[PDB]
PDB file of C-alpha atoms and ligand atoms in Angstrom:
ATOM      1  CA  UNK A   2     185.037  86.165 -22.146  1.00  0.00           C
ATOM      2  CA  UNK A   3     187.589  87.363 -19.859  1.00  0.00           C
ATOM      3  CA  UNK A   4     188.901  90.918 -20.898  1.00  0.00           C
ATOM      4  CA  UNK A   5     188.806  93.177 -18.081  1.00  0.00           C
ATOM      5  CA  UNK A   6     186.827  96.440 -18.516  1.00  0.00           C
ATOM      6  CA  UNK A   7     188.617  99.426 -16.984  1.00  0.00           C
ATOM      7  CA  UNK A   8     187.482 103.021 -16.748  1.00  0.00           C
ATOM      8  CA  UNK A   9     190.082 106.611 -16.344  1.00  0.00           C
ATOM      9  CA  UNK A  10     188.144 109.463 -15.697  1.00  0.00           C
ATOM     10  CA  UNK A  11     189.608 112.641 -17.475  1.00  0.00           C
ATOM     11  CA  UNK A  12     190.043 116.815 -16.410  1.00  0.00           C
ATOM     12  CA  UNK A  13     191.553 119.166 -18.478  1.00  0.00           C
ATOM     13  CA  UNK A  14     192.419 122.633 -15.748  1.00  0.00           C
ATOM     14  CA  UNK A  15     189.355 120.857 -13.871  1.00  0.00           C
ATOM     15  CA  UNK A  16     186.663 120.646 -16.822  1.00  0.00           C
ATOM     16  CA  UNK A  17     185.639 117.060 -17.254  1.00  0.00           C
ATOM     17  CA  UNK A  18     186.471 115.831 -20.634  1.00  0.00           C
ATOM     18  CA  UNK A  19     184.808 112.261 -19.942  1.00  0.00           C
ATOM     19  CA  UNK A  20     185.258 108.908 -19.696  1.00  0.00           C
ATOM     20  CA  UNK A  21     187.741 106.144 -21.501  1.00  0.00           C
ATOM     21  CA  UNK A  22     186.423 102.917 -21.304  1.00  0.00           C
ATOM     22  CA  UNK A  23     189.464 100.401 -22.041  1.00  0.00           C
ATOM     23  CA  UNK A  24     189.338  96.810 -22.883  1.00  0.00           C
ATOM     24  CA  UNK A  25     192.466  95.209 -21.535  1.00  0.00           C
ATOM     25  CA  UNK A  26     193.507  92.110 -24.172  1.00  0.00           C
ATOM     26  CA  UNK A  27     194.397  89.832 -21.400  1.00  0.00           C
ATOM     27  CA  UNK A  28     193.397  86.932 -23.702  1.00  0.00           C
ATOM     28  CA  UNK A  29     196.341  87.870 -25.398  1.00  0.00           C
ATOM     29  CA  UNK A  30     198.306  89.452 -23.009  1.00  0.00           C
ATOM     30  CA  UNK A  31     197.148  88.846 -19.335  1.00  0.00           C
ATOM     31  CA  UNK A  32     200.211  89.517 -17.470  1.00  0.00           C
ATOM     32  CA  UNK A  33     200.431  93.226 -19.130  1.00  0.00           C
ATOM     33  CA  UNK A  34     196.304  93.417 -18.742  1.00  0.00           C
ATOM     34  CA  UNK A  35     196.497  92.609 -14.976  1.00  0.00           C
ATOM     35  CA  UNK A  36     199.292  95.074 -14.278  1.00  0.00           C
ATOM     36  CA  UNK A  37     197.528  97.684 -16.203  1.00  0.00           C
ATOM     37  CA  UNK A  38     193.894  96.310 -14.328  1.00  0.00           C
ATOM     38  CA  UNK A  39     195.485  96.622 -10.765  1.00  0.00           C
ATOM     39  CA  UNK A  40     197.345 100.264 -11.393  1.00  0.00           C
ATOM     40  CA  UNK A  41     193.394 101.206 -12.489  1.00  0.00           C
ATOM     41  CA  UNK A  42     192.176 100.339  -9.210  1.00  0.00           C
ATOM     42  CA  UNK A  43     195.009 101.055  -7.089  1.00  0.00           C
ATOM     43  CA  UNK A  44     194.389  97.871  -5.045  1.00  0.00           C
ATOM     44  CA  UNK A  45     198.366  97.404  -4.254  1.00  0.00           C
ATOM     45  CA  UNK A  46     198.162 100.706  -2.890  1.00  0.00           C
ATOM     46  CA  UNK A  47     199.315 102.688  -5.622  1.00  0.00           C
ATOM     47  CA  UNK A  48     198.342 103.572  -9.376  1.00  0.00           C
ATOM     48  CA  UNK A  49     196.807 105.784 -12.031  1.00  0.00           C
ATOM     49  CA  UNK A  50     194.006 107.621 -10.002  1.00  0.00           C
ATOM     50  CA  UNK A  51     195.161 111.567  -9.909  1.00  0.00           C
ATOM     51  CA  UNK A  52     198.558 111.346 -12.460  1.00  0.00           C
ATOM     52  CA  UNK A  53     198.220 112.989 -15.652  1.00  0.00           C
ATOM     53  CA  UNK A  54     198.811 112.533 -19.196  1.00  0.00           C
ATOM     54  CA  UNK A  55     202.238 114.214 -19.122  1.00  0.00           C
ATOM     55  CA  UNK A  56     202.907 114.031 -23.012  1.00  0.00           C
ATOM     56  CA  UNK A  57     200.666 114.561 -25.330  1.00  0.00           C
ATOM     57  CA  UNK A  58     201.833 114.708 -29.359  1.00  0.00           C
ATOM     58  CA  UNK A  59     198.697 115.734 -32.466  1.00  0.00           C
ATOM     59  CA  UNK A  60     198.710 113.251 -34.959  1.00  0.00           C
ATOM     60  CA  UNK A  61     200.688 110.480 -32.805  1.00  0.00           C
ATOM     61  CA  UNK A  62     199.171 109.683 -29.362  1.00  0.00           C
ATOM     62  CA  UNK A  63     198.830 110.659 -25.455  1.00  0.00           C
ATOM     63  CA  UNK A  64     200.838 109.588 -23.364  1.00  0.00           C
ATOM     64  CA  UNK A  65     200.256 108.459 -19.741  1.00  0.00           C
ATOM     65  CA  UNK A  66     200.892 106.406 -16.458  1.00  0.00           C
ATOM     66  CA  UNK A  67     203.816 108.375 -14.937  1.00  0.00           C
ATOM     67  CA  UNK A  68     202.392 107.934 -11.333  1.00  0.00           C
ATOM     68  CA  UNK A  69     205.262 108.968  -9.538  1.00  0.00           C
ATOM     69  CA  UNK A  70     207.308 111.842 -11.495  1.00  0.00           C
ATOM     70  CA  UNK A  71     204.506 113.174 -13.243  1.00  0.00           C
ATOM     71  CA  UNK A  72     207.177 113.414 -16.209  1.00  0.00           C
ATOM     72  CA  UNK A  73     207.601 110.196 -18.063  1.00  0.00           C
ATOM     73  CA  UNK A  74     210.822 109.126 -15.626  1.00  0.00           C
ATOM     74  CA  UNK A  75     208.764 107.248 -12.844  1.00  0.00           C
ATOM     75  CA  UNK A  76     206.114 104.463 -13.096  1.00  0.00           C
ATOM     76  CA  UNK A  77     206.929 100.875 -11.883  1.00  0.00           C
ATOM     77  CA  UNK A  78     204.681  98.036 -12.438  1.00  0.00           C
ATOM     78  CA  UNK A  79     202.732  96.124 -10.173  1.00  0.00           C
ATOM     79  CA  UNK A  80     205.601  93.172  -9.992  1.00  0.00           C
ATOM     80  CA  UNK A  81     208.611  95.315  -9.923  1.00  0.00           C
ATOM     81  CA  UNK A  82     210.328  98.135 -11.285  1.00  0.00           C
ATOM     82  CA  UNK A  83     210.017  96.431 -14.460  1.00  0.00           C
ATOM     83  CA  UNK A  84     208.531  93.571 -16.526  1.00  0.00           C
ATOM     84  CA  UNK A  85     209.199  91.657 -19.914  1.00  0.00           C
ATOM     85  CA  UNK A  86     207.700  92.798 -23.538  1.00  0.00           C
ATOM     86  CA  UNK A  87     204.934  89.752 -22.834  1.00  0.00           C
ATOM     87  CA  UNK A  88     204.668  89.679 -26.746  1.00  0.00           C
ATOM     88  CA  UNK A  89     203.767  91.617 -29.704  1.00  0.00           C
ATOM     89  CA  UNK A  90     201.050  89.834 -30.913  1.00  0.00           C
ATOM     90  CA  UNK A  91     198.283  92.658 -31.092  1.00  0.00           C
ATOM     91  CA  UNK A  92     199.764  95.478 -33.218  1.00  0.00           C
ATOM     92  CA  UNK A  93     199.288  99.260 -33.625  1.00  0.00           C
ATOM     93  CA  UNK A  94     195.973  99.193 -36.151  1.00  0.00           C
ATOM     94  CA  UNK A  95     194.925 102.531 -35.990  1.00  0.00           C
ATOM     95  CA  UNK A  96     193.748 104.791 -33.293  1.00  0.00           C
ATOM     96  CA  UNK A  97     192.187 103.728 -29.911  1.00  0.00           C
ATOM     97  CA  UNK A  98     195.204 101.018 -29.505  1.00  0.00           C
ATOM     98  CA  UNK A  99     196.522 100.537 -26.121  1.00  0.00           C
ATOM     99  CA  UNK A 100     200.345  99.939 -25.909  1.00  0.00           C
ATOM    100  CA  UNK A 101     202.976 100.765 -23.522  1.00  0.00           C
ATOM    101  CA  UNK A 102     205.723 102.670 -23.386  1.00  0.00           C
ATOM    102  CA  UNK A 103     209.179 101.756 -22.525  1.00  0.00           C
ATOM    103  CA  UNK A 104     212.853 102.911 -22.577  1.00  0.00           C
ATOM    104  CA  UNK A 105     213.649  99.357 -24.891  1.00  0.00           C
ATOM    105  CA  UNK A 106     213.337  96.306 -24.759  1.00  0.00           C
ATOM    106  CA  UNK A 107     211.321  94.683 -21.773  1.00  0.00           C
ATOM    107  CA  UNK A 108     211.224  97.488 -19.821  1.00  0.00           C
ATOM    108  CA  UNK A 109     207.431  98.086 -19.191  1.00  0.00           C
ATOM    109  CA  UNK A 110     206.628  99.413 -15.764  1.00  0.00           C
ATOM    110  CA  UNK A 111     202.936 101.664 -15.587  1.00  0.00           C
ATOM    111  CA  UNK A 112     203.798 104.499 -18.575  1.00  0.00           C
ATOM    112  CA  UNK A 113     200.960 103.882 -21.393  1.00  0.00           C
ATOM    113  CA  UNK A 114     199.839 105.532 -24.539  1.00  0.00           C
ATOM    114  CA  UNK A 115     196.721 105.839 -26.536  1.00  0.00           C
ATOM    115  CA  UNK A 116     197.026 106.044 -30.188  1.00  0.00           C
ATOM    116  CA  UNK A 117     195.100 108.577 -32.597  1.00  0.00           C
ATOM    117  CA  UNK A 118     196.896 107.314 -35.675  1.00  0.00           C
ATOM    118  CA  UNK A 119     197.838 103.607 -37.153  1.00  0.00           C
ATOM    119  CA  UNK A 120     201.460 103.629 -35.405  1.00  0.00           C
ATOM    120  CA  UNK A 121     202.632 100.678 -37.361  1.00  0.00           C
ATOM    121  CA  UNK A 122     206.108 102.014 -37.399  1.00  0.00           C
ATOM    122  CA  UNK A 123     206.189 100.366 -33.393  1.00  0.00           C
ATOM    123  CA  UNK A 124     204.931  97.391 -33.943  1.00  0.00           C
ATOM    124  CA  UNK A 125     207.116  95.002 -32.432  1.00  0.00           C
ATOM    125  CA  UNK A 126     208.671  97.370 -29.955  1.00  0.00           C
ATOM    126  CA  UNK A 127     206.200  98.344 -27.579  1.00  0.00           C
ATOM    127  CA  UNK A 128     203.362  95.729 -26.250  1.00  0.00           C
ATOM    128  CA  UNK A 129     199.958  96.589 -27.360  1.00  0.00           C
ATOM    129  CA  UNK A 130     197.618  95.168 -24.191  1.00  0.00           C
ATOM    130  CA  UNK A 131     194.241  96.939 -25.746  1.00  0.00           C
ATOM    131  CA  UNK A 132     191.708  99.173 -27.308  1.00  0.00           C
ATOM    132  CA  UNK A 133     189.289 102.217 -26.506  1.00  0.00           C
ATOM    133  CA  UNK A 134     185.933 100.465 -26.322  1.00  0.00           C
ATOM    134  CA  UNK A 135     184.112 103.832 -24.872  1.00  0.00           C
ATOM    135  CA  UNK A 136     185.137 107.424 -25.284  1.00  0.00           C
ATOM    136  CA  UNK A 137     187.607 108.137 -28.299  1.00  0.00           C
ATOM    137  CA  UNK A 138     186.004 111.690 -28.346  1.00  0.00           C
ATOM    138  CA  UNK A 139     187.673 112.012 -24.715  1.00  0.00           C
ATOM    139  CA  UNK A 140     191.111 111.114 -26.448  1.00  0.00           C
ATOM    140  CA  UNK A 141     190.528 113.360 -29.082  1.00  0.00           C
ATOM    141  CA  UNK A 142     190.145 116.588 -26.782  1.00  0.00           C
ATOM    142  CA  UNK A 143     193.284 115.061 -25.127  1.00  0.00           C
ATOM    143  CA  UNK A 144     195.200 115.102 -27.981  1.00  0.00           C
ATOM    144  CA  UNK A 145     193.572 118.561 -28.826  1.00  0.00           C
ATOM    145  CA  UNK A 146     195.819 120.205 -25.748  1.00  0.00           C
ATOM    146  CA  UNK A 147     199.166 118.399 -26.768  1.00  0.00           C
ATOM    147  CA  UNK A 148     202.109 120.092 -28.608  1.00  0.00           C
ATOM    148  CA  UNK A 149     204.846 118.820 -31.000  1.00  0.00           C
ATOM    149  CA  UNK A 150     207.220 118.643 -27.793  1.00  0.00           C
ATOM    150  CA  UNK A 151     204.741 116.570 -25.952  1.00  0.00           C
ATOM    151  CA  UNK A 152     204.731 119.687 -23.586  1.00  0.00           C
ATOM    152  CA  UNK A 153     200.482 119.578 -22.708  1.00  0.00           C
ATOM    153  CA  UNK A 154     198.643 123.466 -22.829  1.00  0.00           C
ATOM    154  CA  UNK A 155     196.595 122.554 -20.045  1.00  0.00           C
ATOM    155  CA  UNK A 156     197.185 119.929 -16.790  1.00  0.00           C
ATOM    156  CA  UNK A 157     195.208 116.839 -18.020  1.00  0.00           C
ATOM    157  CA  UNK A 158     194.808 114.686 -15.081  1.00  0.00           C
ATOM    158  CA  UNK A 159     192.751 111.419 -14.451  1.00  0.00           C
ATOM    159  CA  UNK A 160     190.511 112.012 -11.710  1.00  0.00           C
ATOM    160  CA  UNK A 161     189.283 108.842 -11.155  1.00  0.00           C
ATOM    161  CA  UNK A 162     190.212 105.703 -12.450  1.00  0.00           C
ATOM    162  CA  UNK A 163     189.346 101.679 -11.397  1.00  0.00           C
ATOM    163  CA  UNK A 164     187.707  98.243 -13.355  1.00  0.00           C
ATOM    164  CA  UNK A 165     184.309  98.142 -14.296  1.00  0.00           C
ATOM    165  CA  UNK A 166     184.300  93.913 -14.729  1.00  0.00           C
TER     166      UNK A 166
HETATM  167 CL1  LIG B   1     208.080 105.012 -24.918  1.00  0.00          CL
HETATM  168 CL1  LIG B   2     207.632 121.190 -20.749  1.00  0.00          CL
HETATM  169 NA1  LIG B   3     187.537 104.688  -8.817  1.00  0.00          NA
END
């Protein structure tokens, strides 16, 4: 009863490709939902709203949250530069999941994929906080611009981004 509802708001060269609807799991894993929750509305004065999806891999997942470089180098959480794997409890089912990613082992900061395969292979290495609840056809035409280098073929950028409840 508790699972916060967020929303990021997707361009592709300026075309709208929609809206993802997230659930964030913070029944399971509230400290990595409410850092996620508060870079989605910005309200510490920073966060997701105008960064990009920077890699982007078919047949894997797309790759986000890099708020500061753009690049998958930057990001920092809302408590620090860093927080703790919070567990691994909810693992990578198929696509839609929700995990972050990390340079090892408790080093989440605001750099966050969405899955368009089962990626069972990291389970237990990167924290899955949630699941697509509106808009996998968004993801899809996300993943449609990515290469096998991650390198995207057009600027995918979230316009807009904040919590719906
Ligand atoms: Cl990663
Ligand atoms: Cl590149
Ligand atoms: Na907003």
């Amino acid at each position: 009863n508790a699972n916060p509802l967020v929303y990021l708001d997707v361009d592709a060269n300026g075309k709208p490709l929609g809206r993802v609807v997230l659930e964030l799991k913070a029944d399971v894993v509230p400290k990595t939902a409410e850092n996620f929750r508060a870079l989605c509305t910005g309200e510490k004065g920073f966060g997701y709203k105008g960064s990009t999806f920077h890699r982007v891999i078919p047949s894997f997942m797309c790759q986000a949250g890099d708020f500061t470089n753009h690049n998958g180098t930057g990001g920092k959480s809302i408590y620090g530069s860093r927080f703790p794997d919070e567990n691994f409890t909810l693992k990578h089912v198929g696509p839609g999941v929700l995990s972050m990613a990390n340079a090892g082992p408790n080093t989440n900061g605001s750099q966050f994929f969405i899955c368009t395969i089962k990626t069972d292979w990291l389970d237990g290495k990167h924290v899955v906080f949630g699941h697509v609840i509106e808009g996998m056809d968004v993801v899809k035409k996300i993943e449609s611009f990515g290469s096998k280098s991650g390198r995207t073929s057009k600027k995918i950028v979230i316009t807009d981004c904040g919590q719906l409840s």
